[PDB]
Amino acid sequence: AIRVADLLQHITQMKCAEGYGFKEEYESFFEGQSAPWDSAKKDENRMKNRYGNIIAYDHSRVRLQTIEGDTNSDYINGNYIDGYHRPNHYIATQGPMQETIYDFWRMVWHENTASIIMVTNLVEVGRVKCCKYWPDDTEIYKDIKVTLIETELLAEYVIRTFAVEKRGVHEIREIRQFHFTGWPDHGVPYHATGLLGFVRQVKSKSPPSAGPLVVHCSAGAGRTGCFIVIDIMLDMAEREGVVDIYNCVRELRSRRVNMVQTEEQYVFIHDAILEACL
DSSP states along 71-112: TTTTEEEEEEE--SSSTT-EEEEPPP-GGGHHHHHHHHHHTT
Distance between CA 183 and CA 121 in Å, rounded?
A: 8
Distance between CA 206 and CA 191 in Å, rounded?
A: 24
Q: Tell me the catalytic residues.
A: 217
Annotated binding-site members for substrate:
185, 217-223, 261
Amino acid at 232: I
Per DSSP (E only), the strands in 99-191 are 115-118, 123-124, 127-128, 138-141, 144-154, 157-166, 173-180
**What is the experimental method?**
X-ray
Nearest to 35 by CA among 63, 7, 64, 56: 56
Domains of the chain are: 1-278 (3.90.190.10)
Q: Which residues have a Cβ under 8 Å from the Cβ of 203 and sit 6 or more positions away?
A: 231, 234
Distance between CA 68 and CA 70 in Å, rounded?
A: 5
- With beta carbons less than 8 A apart as the criterion, state whether 2 and 244 touch: yes
